[PDB]
Symmetry: C4
Subunit: 93 residues, 4 copies
């Protein structure tokens, strides 16, 4: 599935981009910048809110582009990896 | 190719976010960027660290979510197709 | 569409139930209890967190039952009401 | 009727939430009810007012979301069908 591979790579690149942005512009530790990016694009949300106007505008754009990529990856992960794995693990052998 | 469905979803989304920006900046007294941010993280379900302080703002937010959530995720989906397709196609027929 | 009518009534009943619960057990004003119920079941989330163990257990159960009802209603609202309305409003007359 | 798909999704969900309850109560030092609550509002995307305080807890949460979000919404959907069907059917063939 080349669609799954592309969504995987773009999701990785997206989370790297957010990690770099929030550590640089919002001053977060990289691990906190990564956490922020993940919980934002999965729509879980965080206690942390961007403090700068640049962070706020970026996050708006990051949200609209990133949700579609991340949930596209999550759907393909479920269908192509997790579902076949569960089915295989339910087979009596 | 021209994607009218995408173009209309884009227009509807932007109009919906402008309406929220106007409401929260005037009724809840937020800066425009904060009113837009609240509008976005509400309709995408990310969620705000801020809560409306007025009953009017709370009632508007409830209605805003039901009027807008479907439109916004419709737009996110069509945006995803348009943004991701060049990468997918470049990895198919280079 | 009787499926839409049922989901509508159940969503109303669900939000009334949450309004009554959070005002009684968590001491919220009714409007704040309603707000909490709505943003919780739409997964938006709130700054308010249940303080009592009863509120926490109820909210867990309310979330699992309520998300499915509310997003079922939202999907039918989009398909049966909002989409036809938008299409009708795009017709040149 | 027996809905094995629902039964398995239920089992997977409960096991996933137990794993999160154990992790957050031991690594992040939460009461079990708070660890379960965090686990639930994370995987349903409602979101927590609490953030993990340890790097280990932050890394686990990232992986937890990707391992669990799909399963949990699969379960929410099947639960919705089973919970709503009696009301729908009672309003069809009373
Ligand atoms: Cl501004
Ligand atoms: Cl406990
Ligand atoms: K959410
Ligand atoms: K959220
Ligand atoms: K939140
Ligand atoms: Na918060
Ligand atoms: Na908060």
């Amino acid at each position: 599935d080349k669609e799954f591979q592309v969504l995987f790579v773009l999701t990785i690149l997206t989370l790297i981009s957010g990690t770099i942005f929030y550590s640089t512009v919002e001053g977060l530790r990289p691990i906190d910048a990564l956490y922020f990016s993940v919980v934002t694009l999965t729509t879980v949300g965080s206690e942390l809110m961007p403090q700068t106007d640049f962070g706020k505008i970026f996050t708006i754009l990051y949200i609209f582009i990133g949700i579609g990529l991340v949930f596209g990856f999550i759907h393909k992960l479920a269908v192509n990896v997790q579902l076949p794995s569960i089915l295989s693990n339910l087979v009596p052998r």
